[PDB]
Amino acid sequence: HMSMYNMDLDKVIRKINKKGARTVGLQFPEGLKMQAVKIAKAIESQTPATVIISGDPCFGACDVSDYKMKGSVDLIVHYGHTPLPLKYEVPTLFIEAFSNIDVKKDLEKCLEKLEDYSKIALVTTTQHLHLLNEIKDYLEDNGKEVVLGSSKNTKKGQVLGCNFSSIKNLDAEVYLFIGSGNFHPLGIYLFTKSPVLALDPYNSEIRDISAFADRILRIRFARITKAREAEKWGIIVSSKEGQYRMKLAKEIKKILEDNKMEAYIIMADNINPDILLPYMELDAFVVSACPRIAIDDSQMYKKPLLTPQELEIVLNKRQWENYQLDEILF
Amino acid sequence: SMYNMDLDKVIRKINKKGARTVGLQFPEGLKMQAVKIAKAIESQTPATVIISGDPCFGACDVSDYKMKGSVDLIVHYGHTPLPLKYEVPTLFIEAFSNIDVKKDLEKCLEKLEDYSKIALVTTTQHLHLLNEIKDYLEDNGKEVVLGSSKNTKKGQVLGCNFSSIKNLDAEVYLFIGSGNFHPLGIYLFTKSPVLALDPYNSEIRDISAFADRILRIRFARITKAREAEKWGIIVSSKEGQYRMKLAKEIKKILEDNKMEAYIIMADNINPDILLPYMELDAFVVSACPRIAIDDSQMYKKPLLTPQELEIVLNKRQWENYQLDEILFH
Ligand SMILES: CSC[C@H]1O[C@@H](n2cnc3c(N)ncnc32)[C@H](O)[C@@H]1O
Ligand SMILES: CSC[C@H]1O[C@@H](n2cnc3c(N)ncnc32)[C@H](O)[C@@H]1O
Ligand code: SF4
Numbered sequence A: 001h002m003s004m005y006n007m008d009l010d011k012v013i014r015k016i017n018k019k020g021a022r023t024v025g026l027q028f029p030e031g032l033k034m035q036a037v038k039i040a041k042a043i044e045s046q047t048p049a050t051v052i053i054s055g056d057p058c059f060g061a062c063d064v065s066d067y068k069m070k071g072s073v074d075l076i077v078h079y080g081h082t083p084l085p086l087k088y089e090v091p092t093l094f095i096e097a098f099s100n101i102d103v104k105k106d107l108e109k110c111l112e113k114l115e116d117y118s119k120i121a122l123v124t125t126t127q128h129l130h131l132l133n134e135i136k137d138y139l140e141d142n143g144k145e146v147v148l149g150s151s152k153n154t155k156k157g158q159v160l161g162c163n164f165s166s167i168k169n170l171d172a173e174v175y176l177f178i179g180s181g182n183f184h185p186l187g188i189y190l191f192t193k194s195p196v197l198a199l200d201p202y203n204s205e206i207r208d209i210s211a212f213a214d215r216i217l218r219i220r221f222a223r224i225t226k227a228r229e230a231e232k233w234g235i236i237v238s239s240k241e242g243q244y245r246m247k248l249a250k251e252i253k254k255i256l257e258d259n260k261m262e263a264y265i266i267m268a269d270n271i272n273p274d275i276l277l278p279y280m281e282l283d284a285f286v287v288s289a290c291p292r293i294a295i296d297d298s299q300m301y302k303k304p305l306l307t308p309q310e311l312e313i314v315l316n317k318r319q320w321e322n323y324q325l326d327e328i329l330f
Numbered sequence B: 001s002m003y004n005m006d007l008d009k010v011i012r013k014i015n016k017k018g019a020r021t022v023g024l025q026f027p028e029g030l031k032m033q034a035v036k037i038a039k040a041i042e043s044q045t046p047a048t049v050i051i052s053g054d055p056c057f058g059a060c061d062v063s064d065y066k067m068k069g070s071v072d073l074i075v076h077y078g079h080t081p082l083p084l085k086y087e088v089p090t091l092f093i094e095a096f097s098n099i100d101v102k103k104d105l106e107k108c109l110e111k112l113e114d115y116s117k118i119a120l121v122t123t124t125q126h127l128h129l130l131n132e133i134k135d136y137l138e139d140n141g142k143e144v145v146l147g148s149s150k151n152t153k154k155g156q157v158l159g160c161n162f163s164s165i166k167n168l169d170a171e172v173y174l175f176i177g178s179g180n181f182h183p184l185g186i187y188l189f190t191k192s193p194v195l196a197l198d199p200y201n202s203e204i205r206d207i208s209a210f211a212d213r214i215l216r217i218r219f220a221r222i223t224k225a226r227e228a229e230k231w232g233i234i235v236s237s238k239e240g241q242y243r244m245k246l247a248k249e250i251k252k253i254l255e256d257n258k259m260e261a262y263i264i265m266a267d268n269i270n271p272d273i274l275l276p277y278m279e280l281d282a283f284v285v286s287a288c289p290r291i292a293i294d295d296s297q298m299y300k301k302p303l304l305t306p307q308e309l310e311i312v313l314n315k316r317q318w319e320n321y322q323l324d325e326i327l328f329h
């Protein structure tokens, strides 16, 4: 009852023992790191392995610790994300850490919020993927047509903050997102221009995303207005394997120099305000790393941080009506 | 400029090597010069510059793993190289301080009146000042000795390697530079008088000024850690700081003393990354030895060196306190 997520310890331990691993790395996103010692203690009690907890941030499957842990561990257990189509330097076991939730209490609330629509797309992220089939079957049992988008690199019904490909060609009347966060509903909204609803399986509240979307876009507009006065730019690259986009960074550099501005590529692992402070000549920054940084963290930075698409608006190459979130595609 | 950035030589080196992409690595105090240097390199060579934005604390902290495949050459400022196997070819630039030390020579001599045999000690960025200081003291009746070690040049130390000052037998040690850590280590290893000249602001400080407050802090942290029942052992993935063998030995030792211990690996260590390990009462740092000593004020829970843990477990007497060192990599 106390476990908010299924950490699948039984499976993790059986696989550790069968693999014969003697040193095992653990990676957790921010919301799961509090469980690291409990899980490490269980693994060490039931296997001959020594656990190495990765204390570094872990923002997604773009951010596996295989480069840093190469030579230190035989196996990495990575929680919270499904794997990206990358080749990892160290054997890695991905545990979804599914939400411990019964959504049956909310099915009737969802049906009433959907009374005006026949054709419904269901979307969520990794830790609620296990709920989609129950919701889909309920809706279909109540006269609805339910579609789950897929892609070459995302599971049925799944989006990532940098990959909305699976919701782009669905032709639904309404998109129901499962989750408390607003960034994924924002991208579904902007790409589909269709109604987007979102169920918080904890609040049991269903919300419309249109209001949050306009609030974010007003902020993006104000940041872009400031960036139009920029003369010298930083282009931010991350060395994180799934985030690394040096080809794009060099393309952006040439574009800025073609527009008679200075531009300098800066590469870091974790991006934060403190690492940008020394470069006092730079007026604004374009992020070639995680597409969510410029949108979700912008209030932490004094100077404007922009996506490449937003840089296109600065340069009058993209119009506001075609505002678009950044994505990473493999 | 405050430091000789040796720009003409870096540019000469880039062109001869034919580098198309060049990485730049700076410690904190030099990062603000990154844009001017990138601008000059890109103006005078065909290369594109990548500024390493990550924190950089020493030669232990080269970005050759992160930059691997991105750059043909790395220019690294402010440090002398460590005996590591650098993946990407690297060019180390000392970044010597742009200081004229003449104004402080008589003041140094005045503070050294009681002594005949004087050791001079400094770090990379002030090594170029030592000859002028040494020659002045010798013109004024002093015997001046400079220590050396296999990897550290004449008169130089680092925060994890004090071997060059352990066999000098001087009456007093004059450290050139800011900060308390290096003079604290000289004092602890020699138990001799140690004076420190900060060449930027010309202040000369004695032992109590850089050692008393810190030793009392360490003693208090040790006392608090005697109550700890569950431990974290911090390892760094940074090539020059990696001590996993030691970390695993410390884990086994703590388990022999009927306590729990968990190895946590991180790149950069900071208070925020220890907040989720709420069950842990104390930490032992098996990474850069300066972390536990210099940054203790940032962490609520005790962060100890391995030698301080020895004191907690009653395997080392407090009187035999010893700073941590990385002797082998
Ligand atoms: C919730 S996962 C997305 C968030 O993770 C954080 N994030 C992702 N990648 C990075 C990075 N390379 N550096 C710092 N923060 C990141 C940003 O805050 C982003 O909004
Ligand atoms: C001035 S170089 C020594 C300083 O660098 C910092 N430092 C060295 N290694 C690390 C690390 N792995 N993580 C965070 N800070 C470090 C510590 O603050 C120390 O006081
Ligand atoms: S949105 Fe950012 S953190 Fe999430 S998978 Fe994509 S790049 Fe990684």
Ligand code: SF4
Pocket: B057, B058, B059, B060, B061, B158, B159, B160, B161, B240, B241, B287, B288, B289, B290, B326
């Ligand atoms: S003292 Fe620490 S920062 Fe300086 S070289 Fe040694 S390990 Fe690196």
Ligand SMILES: [Cl-]
Pocket: A244, A245, A246, A247, A248
């Ligand atoms: Cl690329």
